[PDB]
Write an enzyme that holds these catalytic residues in place. Structure first.
Site, mmCIF file in Angstrom:
data_model
loop_
_atom_site.group_PDB
_atom_site.id
_atom_site.type_symbol
_atom_site.label_atom_id
_atom_site.label_comp_id
_atom_site.label_asym_id
_atom_site.label_seq_id
_atom_site.Cartn_x
_atom_site.Cartn_y
_atom_site.Cartn_z
ATOM 1 N N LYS A 48 0.848 -1.189 0.000
ATOM 2 C CA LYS A 48 0.000 0.000 0.000
ATOM 3 C C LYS A 48 0.889 1.246 0.000
ATOM 4 O O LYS A 48 1.749 1.380 0.847
ATOM 5 C CB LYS A 48 -0.870 0.064 1.262
ATOM 6 N N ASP A 143 -15.078 -0.118 12.543
ATOM 7 C CA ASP A 143 -15.490 -0.043 11.148
ATOM 8 C C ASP A 143 -15.411 -1.423 10.492
ATOM 9 O O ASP A 143 -14.954 -1.572 9.376
ATOM 10 C CB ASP A 143 -14.646 1.009 10.416
#
Ligand SMILES: [N+]
Ligand SMILES: [N+]
Length: 351
Positions: A48, A143
């Site tokens: 990433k 989340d």
């Protein structure tokens, strides 16, 4: 090295000599993701690219995720294998995070794949196993949703994205009616809209329940189109809360809102999910319990008959100590945030 330029922060993908090969995977939040060959471990990995240093929020979420992931070590939580960045704060512009290559996530899978009861059971067990560890560290994910659940080609599941995580703080969980909230709408527990800041473990269990429901039918169970619609979706299925559950909501605006709604009866789970295993629906009911105090806890869920083939407490490890380090990170200038990201990533440097 360069990867499929254009927009969305990802022209230059500069990951030093250890990592080679040219495979765009998609867009994260702060840059592109690519797979690459790890010339040391001789396996392909995920990388990433984070370019967070322009915004306070990106930085906070990046620092949070890095501190948590580096402290956690668990089979059902994505790890950080390596971090690539410049040797000095002055030159540090981008940060590359290297992780095990996970070929898909539960979101993508559910778009096109039916899950057998055996898969649902296995996925649910792994989600709860990782969650037990997280909660044992006194951390809340906050989340959980299908896109934050990675899977590899052998169906190993790893929880990701701790950008919204916090240290649990039940004594300071209360707030007023309609208090704004950051986490993904469809997976918010009812109390978020009523009287809760999302600082207790029950918040995560609700999300898991939503994910379970979604695994059963390939559709989100409560797809609210705006803040309060989310509550209306939840009540349309659970039915109106009981006097007892309502007497738990002390704040008047929240209580009276609920009292103003027409009476709704419960939709039976087996009518929503007619092909579901009955033990799955019993566990679902327990996770999607309106009253957060009555909602099942992570360890109880793992102990539920639905998961009997997998449950093994001795093989469901917990964290060596709770986190108590700052996870709000809200009173820190951009300079201190960058410095903290530099310090937290130092162990991966030749140095
Ligand atoms: N909460
Ligand atoms: N209720």
């Amino acid at each position: 090295a360069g990867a499929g330029p254009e927009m969305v922060r990802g022209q230059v993908f500069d990951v030093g000599p250890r990592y080679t090969n040219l495979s765009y995977i998609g867009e994260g939040a702060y840059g592109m993701v690519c797979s690459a060959y790890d010339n040391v471990n001789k396996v392909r990995v995920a990388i990433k690219k984070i370019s967070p240093f322009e915004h306070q929020t990106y930085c906070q979420r990046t620092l949070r995720e890095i501190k948590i992931l580096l402290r956690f070590r668990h089979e059902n939580i994505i790890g950080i294998n390596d971090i690539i960045r410049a040797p000095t704060i002055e030159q540090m512009k981008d940060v590359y995070i290297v992780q095990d290559l996970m070929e898909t996530d539960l979101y993508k899978l559910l778009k096109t794949q039916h899950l057998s009861n055996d898969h649902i059971c296995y996925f649910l067990y792994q989600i709860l196993r990782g969650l037990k560890y997280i909660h044992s560290a006194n951390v809340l994910h906050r989340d959980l949703k299908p896109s934050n659940l990675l899977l590899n080609t052998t169906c190993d599941l790893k929880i990701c994205d701790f950008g919204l995580a916090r240290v649990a703080d039940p004594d300071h969980d209360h707030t007023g009616f309609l208090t704004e909230y950051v986490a993904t709408r469809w997976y918010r527990a009812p109390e978020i809209m009523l009287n809760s800041k999302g600082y207790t473990k029950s918040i995560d269990i609700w999300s898991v329940g939503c994910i379970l429901a979604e695994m059963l039918s390939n559709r989100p169970i409560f797809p609210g189109k705006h803040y309060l619609d989310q509550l209306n979706h939840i009540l349309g299925i659970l039915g109106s809360p009981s006097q007892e559950d309502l007497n738990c909501i002390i704040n008047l605006k929240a209580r009276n809102y609920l009292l103003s709604l027409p009476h709704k009866n419960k939709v039976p789970w087996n009518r929503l999910f007619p092909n579901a295993d009955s033990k799955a629906l019993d566990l679902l009911d327990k996770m999607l319990t309106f009253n957060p105090h009555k909602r099942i806890e992570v360890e109880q869920a793992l102990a539920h008959p639905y998961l009997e083939q997998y449950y093994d407490p001795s093989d469901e490890p917990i964290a060596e100590a709770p986190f108590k380090f700052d996870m709000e990170l809200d009173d820190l200038p951009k300079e201190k945030l960058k410095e903290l990201i530099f310090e937290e990533t130092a162990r991966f440097q030749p140095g």
